[PDB]
Structures are given as structure tokens and as C-alpha cells.
Design a protein around this ligand. Structure first.
Ligand SMILES: Nc1ccn([C@@H]2O[C@H](COP(=O)(O)OP(=O)(O)OP(=O)(O)O)[C@@H](O)[C@H]2O)c(=O)n1
Ligand SMILES: C[S@@+](CC[C@H](N)C(=O)[O-])C[C@H]1O[C@@H](n2cnc3c(N)ncnc32)[C@H](O)[C@@H]1O
Ligand code: SF4
Length: 279
């Protein structure tokens, strides 16, 4: 069986924002009890997990749970890399002061540095860029690696972000071609429809070209993003991200049997840079 070296745990689906492309929508409000999440994280560690990314959903809607899991994953499990990805709006300095020793990487999602763009996308009410710079400075202060995630879409594919990126200096800048996920953002029956925001291969490439002097840039065209992640849902089942049913929960059948039920393109994972110096 595959070794689940780097795992995204979408532990909640609730979110405070309305990004028009969102591919992990608010279809439930279930979250595992802390004791059960810690058991699941323990099984993943024992199966060879090195890196955990907390996602959703917006993680900072659940700071008590998130802090508990981050402290556990570093202090108890001794994971090599504990990461979070957040829209940044609800992050407070106090959280990084309290839990910063246990956070390896903090990724903030900001798709543009024109505040009109972030508002039209539906992520922001006009303070995302300001908040991003603030979080950048806190990571500096609390010894956290600072990472930026950008979705390249119809509304921002012509933008030039170089001066900002030169000011921010994240160690890692993920540039995702907006991705369609069956059952999440692919019709008018779903909570989103991203079809009107999708871009050509050539548009995505010209964006990456515009930013070719950024050595932190990590591009992810649809080909490399689609099946290259290990994704646990709010019940700690692995998701196939293609319309297939989830696995059974790792808490019910164990990691090996759960992972067997999904496809994970390990060739894609390596090629996109999934293994890196993540502490
Ligand atoms: N088909 C896919 C592919 C990816 N994702 C999600 O998209 C996000 C991408 O965020 P990123 O910061 O790239 O995740 P990490 O795993 O932290 O990336 P890396 O280790 O490469 O820095 C993750 O939450 C992942 O689970 C998804 O929901 N569906
Ligand atoms: C679902 S969000 C969860 C964490 C948090 N709410 C945030 O937005 O950072 C995880 C990452 O996927 C990105 N993402 C969301 N929808 C996407 C899509 N359709 N295609 C590509 N990336 C997308 C987000 O911008 C973010 O960087
Ligand atoms: S991508 Fe936007 S809508 Fe989706 S979970 Fe993150 S902030 Fe919320």
C-alpha cells in the first residue's frame, strides 16, 4: 500500500467567505471530537505520515480544536511538519504566540493584490492584503515559515504580483489553476459553479511566465493538482475528488484499508514538489 507521507485534513466544512470557485464547500457542519481526531492522527503517524496540513473549510473558525491538534501533532506525535492553510481573516496574533512553537508552516490564501479582485472573487471585504502583510510579520516574529496560496482564475490571470511577492518573500508560493471538482463546484446543483472562472492552459502558463523570477513559485496546472493530494474529510475518510464515494473512515477500518479505496497519483505528487524542506 501507499505511504501517506503528506496529508490534508479538511476537518470542518464551515466557512465565513463565499469564494466563487471554492472546491470544498459547506455541505455539513460535522467535526470529529478532539479525542477521536487525535486517534486518527496517531494512526496516520504510525502509517508514516510526516506532514499534516489543516484545511477545510476555514480552520480559524475552530481555534480551540485547531490549537489542540497542532499542539498534539508536534508535542506528542513529533510530526516533521505541521501546517495550516487559512483565508487569514480570523487569525489573531495571540494564536501564533500561544501555538507558534508547534506550527511549522502557515499558508495564507490571497488570490490578488487588487482589493476589488478579492471582493469580486468573494473572499474578502477589502482588507485581505493588509491582513496578509500583518500575518507575514507575525510569522517572522514567531519563527513560522510563511507561505502564500494563490488561485489563478478568470479575474486575476493578467495581474502582476511581483512587487508584492518581493516585499512579502514567502518561502513557498503555490499558484493553482482553478480546478473543477465533480460534486463540489461543477454545476448549478452544487453550492458553487466555477465553470465561468476557469482558464486556458495558455493563460495559466503566461501567468507563471510573468512571475518567472520568483524562485518561491510552485505552479499547479489542473493536470498536477487533480489527483496528487491525500485528502481526509470531516469524518476522516479519504476523498477521491472525482465523484467517487469516500473511503471508509480511518477511525473505522484503519489507514491501510481506507487509503486502498482512493487513487493517489504519487508521480504527480512528486512532480509538483510535494516533498520539500517543510520545517
Ligand atoms: N483535487 C484536490 C487537490 C487539492 N485539494 C486541496 O487543495 C489544497 C491545496 O493547498 P496546499 O497548501 O497546496 O496544500 P499542502 O498539502 O500544504 O501543500 P504542500 O505540502 O505542497 O505545500 C489542500 O488543502 C488540498 O487538500 C483539493 O481539495 N482537491
Ligand atoms: C478550500 S481552501 C481551505 C482553507 C481556507 N479556507 C483557505 O481558503 O485558505 C484550501 C486551498 O484551496 C484553494 N482552492 C479553493 N478552491 C479552489 C479551486 N477551485 N481550485 C484551486 N484551488 C482552490 C484555496 O484558495 C486554498 O488555498
Ligand atoms: S476557498 Fe474561500 S469559500 Fe472555500 S473554504 Fe477557503 S475561504 Fe472559504
Amino acid at each position: 500500500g501507499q505511504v501517506p507521507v503528506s496529508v490534508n485534513y479538511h476537518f470542518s466544512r464551515k466557512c465565513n467567505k463565499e469564494c466563487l470557485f471554492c472546491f470544498h464547500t459547506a455541505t455539513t457542519s460535522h467535526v470529529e471530537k478532539p479525542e477521536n481526531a487525535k486517534r486518527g492522527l496517531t494512526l496516520l503517524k504510525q502509517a508514516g505520515m510526516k506532514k499534516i496540513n489543516f484545511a477545510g473549510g476555514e480552520p480559524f473558525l475552530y481555534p480551540k480544536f485547531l490549537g489542540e491538534m497542532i499542539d498534539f501533532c508536534k508535542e506528542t506525535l513529533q510530526l516533521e511538519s505541521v501546517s495550516i492553510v487559512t483565508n487569514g481573516s480570523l487569525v489573531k496574533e495571540q494564536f501564533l504566540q500561544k501555538h507558534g512553537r508547534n506550527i511549522d508552516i502557515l499558508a495564507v490564501s490571497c488570490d490578488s493584490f487588487n482589493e476589488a479582485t478579492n471582493i469580486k472573487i468573494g473572499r474578502g471585504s477589502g482588507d485581505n492584503v493588509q491582513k496578509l502583510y500583518e500575518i507575514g510579520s507575525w510569522c517572522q516574529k514567531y519563527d513560522i515559515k510563511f507561505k502564500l496560496n494563490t488561485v489563478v482564475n478568470k479575474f486575476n490571470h493578467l495581474e502582476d504580483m511581483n512587487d508584492h511577492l518581493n516585499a512579502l518573500q514567502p518561502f513557498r508560493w503555490k499558484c493553482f489553476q482553478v480546478l473543477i471538482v465533480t460534486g463540489e463546484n461543477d454545476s448549478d446543483k452544487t453550492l458553487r459553479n466555477a465553470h465561468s472562472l476557469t482558464i486556458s492552459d495558455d493563460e495559466f502558463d503566461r501567468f507563471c511566465e510573468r512571475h518567472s523570477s520568483q524562485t518561491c513559485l510552485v505552479p499547479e496546472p489542473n493536470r498536477l493538482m487533480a489527483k496528487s493530494y491525500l485528502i481526509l474529510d470531516e469524518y476522516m475518510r479519504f476523498l477521491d475528488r472525482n465523484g467517487q464515494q469516500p473511503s471508509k473512515s480511518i477511525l473505522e477500518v484503519g489507514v491501510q484499508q481506507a487509503l486502498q479505496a482512493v487513487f493517489w497519483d504519487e508521480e504527480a505528487f512528486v512532480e509538483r514538489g510535494g516533498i520539500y524542506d517543510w520545517n
